[PDB]
């Protein structure tokens, strides 16, 4: 149930990171996920390579 459990490098282990002040905006993870999924979907719809 620890939603904020993350990798702690200062203590070299696992711990809560909100107390380590490690945060990023939502429109970083959301944007990365959306863009990566779109690129993967675009790549999957390819079946041939033609040289001009």
């Amino acid at each position: 149930g620890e939603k904020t459990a993350g990798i702690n490098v200062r203590k070299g282990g696992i711990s809560n990171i909100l107390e380590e002040l490690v945060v990023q905006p939502l429109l970083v993870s959301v944007s990365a996920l959306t863009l990566a999924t779109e690129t993967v979907r675009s790549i999957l719809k390819i079946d041939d390579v033609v040289n001009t």
Binding site: L21, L27, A32, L33, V49
Partner: protein, 156 residues
């Protein structure tokens, strides 16, 4: 339903495997430049110019990759830089990992169209999960802004 439709070509499978291998190679290349413990890469172009950088978009665009899938990954990093501004390495790593999974998915005998729709469903569910996990913030809170900036600079 019996034997089913026979695959005459086997060329689309080779193309898909080559694209996935190129993307996975790009991710493994920019895999060690992630997080506060990541290290910078040094790039020397055709001229004498030298670049030492940790930015994923800069690393990808500085080096000529010559492969189509790698070029879509470079464009992906550029787009992520345009929209969000950071995470340009994480998006490329995620795309490479997704295609690496698609390798085994295709080998299992799944058409690369069910994979796309299932990935869209997973993306929507993950967007819902991330939105649920998020926390509201206001610009009047200087501490959160300072923490975000420090986290951004932690890996440089």
């Amino acid at each position: 339903r019996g034997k089913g439709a026979y695959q005459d070509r086997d060329k689309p499978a080779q193309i898909r495997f080559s694209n996935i291998s190129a993307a996975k190679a790009v991710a493994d290349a920019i895999r060690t430049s992630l997080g506060p413990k990541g290290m910078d890469k040094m790039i020397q172009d055709g001229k004498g110019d030298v670049t030492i950088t940790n930015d994923g978009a800069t690393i990808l665009k500085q080096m000529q990759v010559l492969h189509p899938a790698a070029r879509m990954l470079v464009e992906l990093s550029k787009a992520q830089d345009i929209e969000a501004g950071d995470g340009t390495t994480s998006v490329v790593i995620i795309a490479g990992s997704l295609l690496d999974s698609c390798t085994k998915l295709l080998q299992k005998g799944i058409h690369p169209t069910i994979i796309s729709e299932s990935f869209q469903k997973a993306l929507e569910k993950g967007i819902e999960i991330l939105t649920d996990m998020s926390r509201p913030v206001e610009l009047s809170d200087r501490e959160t802004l300072l923490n975000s900036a420090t986290t951004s600079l932690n890996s440089k």
